[PDB]
């Protein structure tokens, strides 16, 4: 796989109305502070994205959120780095 110089991750398999406020609530309550959040309600893809101020919370929250049962659905988190081109 490729490296990553950030502290953000994306969620998948989360077909719920969990909005920025929701994910932010559970995140902060689960010992995970985030500075940025985002979700996709426009479609039924059930995928979100969160970011932490530090890497410690990112790796921890990622390993603590990765593969989790919620509302009868198994949600998973995976980092996705998409930096700019070389030009």
From Swiss-Prot:
The principal localisation class reads cytoplasm
The GO cellular component terms are:
cytoplasm; cytoplasmic stress granule; nucleus; ribonucleoprotein complex
- Keywords associated with the record: Cytoplasm, Methylation, mRNA processing, Nucleus, Phosphoprotein, Repeat, Ribonucleoprotein, Ribosome biogenesis, RNA-binding
A GO molecular function annotation here is: telomeric repeat-containing RNA binding
Coiled coil start-end = none
**Compartments (UniProt record):** Cytoplasm; Nucleus; Cytoplasm, Stress granule
Q: Which residues carry this modification: Phosphoserine?
A: 19, 31
Modification after translation (UniProt): Methylated by HMT1. The methylation is required for nuclear export.
What's a BP term from Gene Ontology annotated to this protein?
A: negative regulation of termination of RNA polymerase II transcription, poly(A)-coupled
The RRM domain covers: 7-82
Functional note = Involved in mRNA processing and export. Required for efficient splicing of a large set of pre-mRNAs by efficient co-transcriptional recruitment of the splicing machinery. Remains associated with the mRNP during early steps of translation elongation.
Q: How does it assemble?
A: Interacts with RRP6.
Q: Which family does it belong to?
A: Belongs to the RRM GAR family.
Q: What else is known?
A: Present with 78700 molecules/cell in log phase SD medium.
What protein name applies here? Serine/arginine (SR)-type shuttling mRNA binding protein NPL3
Give the organism, scientific name: Saccharomyces cerevisiae (strain ATCC 204508 / S288c)
Q: Which gene is annotated as encoding this protein in its UniProt record?
A: NPL3
Which start and end residues of the full protein are shown? 194 to 280 of 414
